Amino acid sequence: VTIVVRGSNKLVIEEAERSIHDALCVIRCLVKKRALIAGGGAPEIELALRLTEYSRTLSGMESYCVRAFADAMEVIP
Amino acid sequence: VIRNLIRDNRVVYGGGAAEISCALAVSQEADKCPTLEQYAMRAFADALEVIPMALSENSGMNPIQTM
């Protein structure tokens, strides 16, 4: 398909096409992965929280290596 | 040693077993601390592990793998 667009200035039409891409991109993300998640860095906290619990069950150097992976996620929120 | 044994018969297993067990309890209870001391409680667990991590290093073994 193809989309025709109109607008007064070049910027008015420029941001229209820039927004359509992000809309198509976020919609493309749902087609491949039909799911949603919360923002605000909440995925990084649940990831960092449960990975620290997952590292307690691991053995060897993977414990500190996975704990360091968990603490690194906390930089986002 | 004998003074504390008589004053209190209760004893714990050395060799770093107590420090590792305490670090696990502190780590679990740290999640139940909704305040800035949560980062400090986690640091107390990692600091407790230096005593057993030091015995492994002084024995000529990998400290972290043995920890």
UniProtKB/Swiss-Prot annotation, chain A:
It comes from Homo sapiens (Human). ADP binds at G40. This is T-complex protein 1 subunit delta. The modification Phosphoserine is found at S59. It is found in: Cytoplasm; Melanosome; Cytoplasm, Cytoskeleton, Microtubule organizing center, Centrosome; Cytoplasm, Cytoskeleton, Cilium basal body. Component of the chaperonin-containing T-complex (TRiC), a hexadecamer composed of two identical back-to-back stacked rings enclosing a protein folding chamber. Each ring is made up of eight different subunits: TCP1/CCT1, CCT2, CCT3, CCT4, CCT5, CCT6A/CCT6, CCT7, CCT8. Interacts with PACRG. Interacts with DNAAF4. Interacts with DLEC1. Belongs to the TCP-1 chaperonin family. The chain holds residues 386 to 462 of 539 of the full protein. Component of the chaperonin-containing T-complex (TRiC), a molecular chaperone complex that assists the folding of actin, tubulin and other proteins upon ATP hydrolysis. The TRiC complex mediates the folding of WRAP53/TCAB1, thereby regulating telomere maintenance. As part of the TRiC complex may play a role in the assembly of BBSome, a complex involved in ciliogenesis regulating transports vesicles to the cilia. It is linked to De novo genetic variants in nearly every subunit of the TRiC complex, including CCT4, have been found in individuals with a broad spectrum of brain malformations, and clinical phenotypes ranging from mild to severe epilepsy, developmental delay, intellectual disability, ataxia, and other features of cerebral malfunction. It comes from the Eukaryota.
Swiss-Prot record, chain B:
It comes from the Eukaryota. Ubiquitinated by the DCX(DCAF12) complex specifically recognizes the diglutamate (Glu-Glu) at the C-terminus, leading to its degradation. Coiled coil: none annotated. ATP binds at G15. ADP binds at G15. Induction: Down-regulated in response to enterovirus 71 (EV71) infection (at protein level). It is found in: Cytoplasm; Cytoplasm, Cytoskeleton, Microtubule organizing center, Centrosome. Component of the chaperonin-containing T-complex (TRiC), a molecular chaperone complex that assists the folding of actin, tubulin and other proteins upon ATP hydrolysis. The TRiC complex mediates the folding of WRAP53/TCAB1, thereby regulating telomere maintenance. As part of the TRiC complex may play a role in the assembly of BBSome, a complex involved in ciliogenesis regulating transports vesicles to the cilia. It is linked to Neuropathy, hereditary sensory, with spastic paraplegia, autosomal recessive: A disease characterized by spastic paraplegia and progressive distal sensory neuropathy leading to mutilating ulcerations of the upper and lower limbs. De novo genetic variants in nearly every subunit of the TRiC complex, including CCT5, have been found in individuals with a broad spectrum of brain malformations, and clinical phenotypes ranging from mild to severe epilepsy, developmental delay, intellectual disability, ataxia, and other features of cerebral malfunction. Belongs to the TCP-1 chaperonin family. Component of the chaperonin-containing T-complex (TRiC), a hexadecamer composed of two identical back-to-back stacked rings enclosing a protein folding chamber. Each ring is made up of eight different subunits: TCP1/CCT1, CCT2, CCT3, CCT4, CCT5, CCT6A/CCT6, CCT7, CCT8. Interacts with PACRG. Interacts with DNAAF4. Interacts with DLEC1. Interacts with SPMAP2. This is T-complex protein 1 subunit epsilon. It comes from Homo sapiens (Human). The gene is CCT5. The chain holds residues 408 to 474 of 541 of the full protein.
